[PDB]
């Protein structure tokens, strides 16, 4: 049942709607949080933004990357003066079930295969109570981050799969993103051994031995590839991100923004600590209407869960090939400083997908590309008919909190600027 948002704090001016779709039959409560565009919301394209974890809730890129207001010790909203709805209408959905706000009853949700699932379901209700975001012929994308870079490609497919289709996907962005671990794996090491920007963090003797333990883990990983089971998958995920993770984090260096400190335990962005508690205060967890107890940013069950399932380590890289090949422009950048999911490797993932153009794209030229609004050069480009890699420069996990002036002109001008860089 929807309320509005409308009652409080957040966007003004706007016309924000928020509250729950019900799947009946699974007993799944799908939880969203909306806004209209700040220009027109009836020309400007829609946008379903997704966050990681696995297991984490999308309100945070809400209010603390790139969404109208974030949250101060004053637990009191505030304006961005970069917001993503700047131009367009902003859905913010918490997936999977019993995320953030949504919630269920007896489910599943162990993997990704499935959440895509629940979320095609969603999007299909949500699209038909709120029929005024398509027939105008509105631009629908999804996007998001990390871990969402193995839900993006599997939701996508998903989408695509119904002919039956209540609305139409016109790209896709994932940013900061992992999604195809058995190439981006590599990227580690360097990526901490002073080759990808910021300068080696780790003595050389760690180092090493990252490249020991590497051809052990990359087995791992083509193992879990060809069979995708279980077996190798849950093994090669642990090796992995043992050998190779773990040694950054001993240097308690925030695993975000190799910039940057957070040392073991406490936040390695503590603002974030300050959005756990505006959501759950009385007042707050009223306007929206939503039917939960206690808000919590991610469930560490269902992380738990997809860990055990196999996921982090599958090659859903492979739908993106069948996306490139059925002709959806698509958007992969990274902010250069983030070492969880490095602009290094996700360049390189990239840069040896297959799809038709492949020979071509591995022929393009990188290029310096410079920012819509502040007329600055902010990252660079490798475009290819509608794949594009954009390393942003002074990008972290979130390129959105650190340098909002440019997301906003990646955004915008991809949103609009024809799905070219």
């Known amino acids: 049942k929807i309320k509005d948002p409308k009652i409080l704090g957040i966007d003004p001016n706007v016309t924000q709607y928020t509250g729950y779709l019900d799947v009946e ?43 109208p207001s974030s949250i ?14 700047s131009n367009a209408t902003v859905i913010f959905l918490d997936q999977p079930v019993n995320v953030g706000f949504s919630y269920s009853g007896s489910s599943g ?12 379901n969603f999007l299909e209700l949500f699209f038909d109570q709120f029929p005024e975001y398509v027939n105008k012929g509105q631009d629908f994308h999804i996007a998001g981050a990390s871990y969402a870079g193995h839900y993006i490609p ?85 090796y992995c991100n043992n050998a190779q993770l773990a040694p950054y984090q001993r240097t308690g260096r925030n695993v975000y923004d190799i910039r940057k400190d957070c040392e073991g335990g406490n936040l390695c962005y503590p603002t974030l600590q300050d959005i756990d508690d505006y959501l759950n205060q009385d007042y707050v967890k009223e306007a929206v209407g939503a039917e939960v107890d206690h808000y919590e940013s991610c469930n560490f069950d269902i992380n738990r869960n997809f860990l055990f399932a196999g996921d982090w380590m599958k090659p859903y890289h492979t739908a993106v090939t069948d996306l490139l090949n059925q002709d959806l422009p698509i958007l992969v950048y990274a902010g250069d400083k983030d070492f969880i999911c490095n602009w290094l490797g996700n360049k390189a993932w990239t840069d040896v ?69």
């Not at 949700?109 to 095609?120: E, Q």
């Open 154 to 238: 599997v939701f996508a497919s998903e989408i695509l799969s119904h002919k039956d289709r209540n609305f139409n996907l016109t790209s896709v962005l994932i940013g900061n993103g992992l999604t195809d671990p058995l190439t981006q794996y590599n990227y580690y090491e360097p990526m901490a051994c002073g080759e990808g920007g910021e300068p080696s963090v780790l003595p050389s003797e760690e180092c090493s031995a990252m490249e020991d333990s590497l051809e052990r883990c990359l087995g791992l990983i083509e193992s879990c590839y060809d069979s995708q089971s279980v077996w190798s998958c849950v093994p090669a995920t642990i």
């Open 25 to 67: 039959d699974e007993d799944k409560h799908f939880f969203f949080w909306t806004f209209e565009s700040r220009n027109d919301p009836a020309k400007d394209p829609v946008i379903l933004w997704l966050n990681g974890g696995p297991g984490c809730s999308s309100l945070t890129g809400l209010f603390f990357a790139l969404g």
């Open 109 to 120: 949700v162990s993997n990704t295969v499935a959440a895509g699932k629940d979320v095609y």
């Open 353 to 421: 997908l297959p799809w038709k153009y492949d020979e071509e794209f591995a022929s393009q030229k990188v290029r310096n590309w410079t920012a819509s609004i502040t007329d600055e050069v902010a990252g660079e480009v490798k475009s290819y008919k509608h794949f594009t890699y954009l390393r942003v420069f002074n990008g972290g996990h979130m390129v959105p909190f650190d340098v909002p002036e440019n997301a906003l002109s990646m955004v915008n001008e991809w949103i609009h600027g024809g799905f070219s860089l």
């Open 72 to 85: 101060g010790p004053d637990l009191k909203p505030i304006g961005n003066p970069y917001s993503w709805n």
